[PDB]
């Protein structure tokens, strides 16, 4: 084990089995003894930590993935995102880079997700005789 | 109490109110915070369904 | 009383033995729970088994219980020295009290 | 936990006696007391037992009109564990009530086999003599 | 229906058979009218049952239990935590006694939990064919 | 696609087919540089946000139902809390009447939630051989 954001010079896949260290190590909790301008900050940054954290499990759980961590889709790759196949993305690029090549078409990708989601549910609410 | 003397032959009392918290505790004595800890793990014979 | 054990049982050191408990369908035994005590004379017992089957915390599982539908049986596996005593079972349910059985004298030769 | 019963007493047939029943080491309103007897010419004897939580009683038809079974408040020590005390009070002894009676602590809070005797006291010797 | 905490005395199932009383009335909302110290003191406790229950959240959901309640994992008892057979535990001892006696172990416990959740996950991204 | 909150108006099915919409645009994220009357009057906001939101995800996790949207439930419909037929509910009531006509027994419909929810957890409990 490498610690909090170990791998994140390692190929994505390397990183990948180990995304539970850093996902862990993202929320905190860091008491206190403020009972003045250095509270208003302590206050300050604390809601900002959670409030990210609870931004990406709104996106988790609209995404059919509330669950988190790893989760599979039914949208397809378009390869206009991204032409390069598996072996390359997952053993010749790490995560930062990845990031990087797709922040183009990240928000494409999340609608998809939603979209395809949703349809997924409406299909549920038909699946009963 | 006063300062002690000659052992069990007379004891003498005095009032005093030398601080404010005597006060606080004399209203809660009654009371205790805790904080609840909703997190149990605890052995059965039960596996999750396997992948 | 109407619960009968075998009066008395021997066995070697590191074999097996088995003591009987048994009575009329009032007592014994479908539906009436069957728990097993080693109750050394002039002493306080210990709970060995309790539930038919289930042993009394910190009991090594050389002892074991087995209630049939005509009597209850407990097992003794691997005698050894102290096993040799006095054991006794006893027909319970819920809200009657204990009913105790003849008893059984465990005798370890060798 | 430990139960610590009373020492001894001799009486004689026709009387009656007292025997205590003292307990540490375990919450004694959680645990049923039981009174259990032994003599030597009819063996051991279930007699009742008794609920220190609620003071329900169950005493066996052969002893319902001659013993008494009280327990006390329990004493508590720390917040697992207190001290505790229950009595047993046999009246018209006789000569085949001579023996060894004994409490005991109860085996499981709730299941099948709450009130079984399972941590039992050193035991009182009660002779019935003249 | 005995309330919030109502079966802290009970044995460890009466008390497991209504976890839901105690884990739903663990989170309230007082609203305000605080348009102050008294104010610093309402917003500073506002943030902490939240971040409290976030926290929790996040273990639950890091362990394959983002549903909350009651989940099963496996990982197996190993002996050496507690010694007691499932009578003793379930109908002899309290929860508050039960996390005096596991205290010793319960980290570790969690990090198995958490590294079974991960293999399985890894299982399940290699479930396909 | 008509925004946040354009299918008020709609049929209550026409709406559910793009809750979605409505579900994801709950939760905003408004920077700051307050780095005073307006600082206090932002952090107060922040805090209720994401409480609500909290609130919302506790109610939806103690009902079975943490990855949001749409679920269904064990509690059959007691008819004494609307008599209407399902054309009638679907494609003749918008959500907010809806809503105004079953206010009366909301919480009952909550209490039957949480409690089927808990016995299907004791049933899974006991579900293993
Ligand atoms: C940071 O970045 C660096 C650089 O990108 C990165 O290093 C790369 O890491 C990847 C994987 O992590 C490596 O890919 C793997 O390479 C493994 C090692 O190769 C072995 O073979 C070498 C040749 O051995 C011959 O010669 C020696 C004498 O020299 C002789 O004794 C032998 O018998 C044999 O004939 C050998 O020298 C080499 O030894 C180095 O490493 C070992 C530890 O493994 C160490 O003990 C030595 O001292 C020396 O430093 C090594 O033994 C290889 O095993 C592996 O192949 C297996 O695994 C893959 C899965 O990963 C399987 O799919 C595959 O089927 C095999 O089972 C794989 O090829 C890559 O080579 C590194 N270097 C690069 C890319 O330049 C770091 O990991 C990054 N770190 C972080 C934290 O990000
Ligand atoms: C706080 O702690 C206390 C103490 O630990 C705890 O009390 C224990 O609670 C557990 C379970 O909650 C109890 O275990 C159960 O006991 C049930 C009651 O036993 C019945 O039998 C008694 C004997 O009846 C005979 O005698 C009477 C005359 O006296 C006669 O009429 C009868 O016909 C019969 O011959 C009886 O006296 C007793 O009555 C008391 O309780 C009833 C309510 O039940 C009340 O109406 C009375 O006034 C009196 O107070 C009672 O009727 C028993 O039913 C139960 O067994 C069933 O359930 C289990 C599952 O729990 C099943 O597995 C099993 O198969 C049976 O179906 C079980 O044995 C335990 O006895 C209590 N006492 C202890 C441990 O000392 C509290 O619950 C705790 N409370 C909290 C909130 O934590
Ligand atoms: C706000 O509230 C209003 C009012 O409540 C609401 O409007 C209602 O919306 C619902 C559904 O959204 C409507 O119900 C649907 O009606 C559809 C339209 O009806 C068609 O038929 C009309 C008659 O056509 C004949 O006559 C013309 C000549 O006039 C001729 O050429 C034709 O060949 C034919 O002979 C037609 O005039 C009408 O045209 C209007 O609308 C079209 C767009 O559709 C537009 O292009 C025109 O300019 C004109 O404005 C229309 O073509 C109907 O298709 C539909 O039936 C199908 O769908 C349902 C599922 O919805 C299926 O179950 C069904 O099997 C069919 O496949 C359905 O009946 C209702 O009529 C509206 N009006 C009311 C209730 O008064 C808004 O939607 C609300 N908006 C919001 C945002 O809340
Ligand atoms: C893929 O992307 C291209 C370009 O962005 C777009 O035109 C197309 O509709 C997308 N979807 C496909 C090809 O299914
Ligand atoms: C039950 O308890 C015994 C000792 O009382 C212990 O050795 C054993 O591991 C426990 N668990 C079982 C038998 O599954
Ligand atoms: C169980 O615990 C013991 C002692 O903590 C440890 O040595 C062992 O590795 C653990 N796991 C087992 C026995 O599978
Ligand atoms: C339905 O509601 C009525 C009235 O509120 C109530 O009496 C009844 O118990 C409920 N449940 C049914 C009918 O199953």
């Known amino acids: 084990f490498l610690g909090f954001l170990g791998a994140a010079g390692s190929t994505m896949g390397a990183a990948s089995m180990t995304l539970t260290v850093q996902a862990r190590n993202l929320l905190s909790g860091i008491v206190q003894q403020q009972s003045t301008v250095w509270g208003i900050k302590q206050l300050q940054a604390r809601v900002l930590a959670v409030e990210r954290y609870l931004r990406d499990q709104q996106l988790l759980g609209i995404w059919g993935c509330s669950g988190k961590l790893i989760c599979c889709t039914n949208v397809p790759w378009n390869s206009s995102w991204s032409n390069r196949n598996l072996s390359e993305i997952w053993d010749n690029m790490t995560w930062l880079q990845w990031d990087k090549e797709i922040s183009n078409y990240t928000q494409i990708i999340y609608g998809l997700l939603e979209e395809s989601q949703n349809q997924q549910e409406k299909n549920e609410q038909d699946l009963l005789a | 109490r006063d300062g002690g003397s000659t052992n069990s032959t007379t004891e003498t009392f005095r009032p005093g109110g030398g601080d404010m918290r005597d006060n606080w505790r004399s209203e809660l004595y009654k009371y205790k915070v805790v904080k609840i800890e909703p997190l149990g793990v605890a052995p059965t014979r039960c596996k999750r369904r396997v992948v | 009383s109407v619960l009968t054990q075998s009066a008395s049982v021997s066995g070697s050191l590191g074999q097996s033995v088995t003591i009987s408990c048994t009575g009329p369908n009032s007592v014994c035994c479908s539906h009436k729970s069957i728990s097993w005590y080693q109750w050394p004379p002039g002493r306080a017992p210990t709970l060995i088994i309790y539930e038919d089957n289930e042993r009394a915390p910190g009991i090594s599982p050389r002892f074991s219980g087995y209630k049939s539908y005509w009597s209850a049986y407990l097992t003794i596996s691997d005698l050894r020295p102290e096993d040799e005593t006095t054991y006794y079972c006893c027909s319970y349910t819920h809200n009657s009290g204990c009913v105790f059985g003849t008893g059984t004298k465990v005798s370890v030769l060798g | 936990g430990q139960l610590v019963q009373s020492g001894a007493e001799l009486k004689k047939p026709g009387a009656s006696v007292k025997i205590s029943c003292k307990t540490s080491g375990y919450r004694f309103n959680f645990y049923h007391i039981n009174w259990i007897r032994q003599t030597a010419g009819r063996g051991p004897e279930w007699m009742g037992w008794?609920?220190?939580?609620?003071?329900?009683?169950?005493?066996?038809?052969?002893?319902?009109?001659r013993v008494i079974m009280t327990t006390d408040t329990e004493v508590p020590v720390t917040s697992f564990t207190s001290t505790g005390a229950a009595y047993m009070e046999i009246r018209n002894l006789k000569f085949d009530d001579t023996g060894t009676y004994f409490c005991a602590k109860g085996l499981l809070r709730d299941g099948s086999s709450t009130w079984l005797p399972y941590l039992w006291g050193q035991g009182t010797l009660l002779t019935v003599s003249s | 229906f005995l309330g919030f905490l109502g079966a802290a005395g009970s044995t460890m199932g009466a008390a497991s058979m209504t976890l839901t009383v105690q884990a739903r009335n663990l989170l309230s909302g007082i609203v305000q009218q605080q348009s102050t110290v008294w104010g610093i003191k309402q917003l500073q406790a506002r943030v902490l049952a939240v971040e409290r229950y976030l926290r929790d959240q996040q273990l639950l959901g890091i362990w394959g239990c983002s549903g909350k309640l009651i989940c099963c994992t496996n990982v197996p008892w190993n002996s050496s935590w507690s010694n007691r057979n499932l009578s003793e535990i379930w109908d002899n001892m309290t929860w508050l006694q039960w996390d005096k006696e596991i205290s010793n172990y319960t980290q570790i416990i969690y990090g198995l939990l958490e590294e079974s959740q991960n293999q399985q996950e890894k299982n399940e991204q290699d479930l396909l064919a | 696609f008509l925004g946040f909150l354009g299918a008020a108006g709609s049929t209550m099915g026409a709406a559910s087919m793009t809750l979605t919409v409505q579900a994801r645009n709950l939760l905003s994220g408004i920077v700051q540089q307050q780095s005073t009357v307006w600082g206090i009057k932002q952090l107060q906001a922040r805090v209720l946000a994401v409480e609500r939101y909290l609130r919302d995800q506790q109610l939806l996790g103690i009902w079975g139902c943490s990855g949001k949207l749409i679920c269904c439930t064990n509690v059959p419909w007691n008819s004494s809390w609307s008599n209407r037929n399902l054309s009638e509910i679907w494609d003749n009531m918008t959500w907010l009447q809806w809503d105004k006509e079953i206010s009366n027994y909301t919480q009952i419909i909550y209490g039957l939630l949480e409690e089927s929810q808990n016995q299907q957890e004791k049933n899974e409990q006991d579900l293993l051989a």
């Open positions: 008794i609920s220190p939580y609620s003071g329900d009683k169950n005493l066996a038809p052969a002893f319902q009109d």
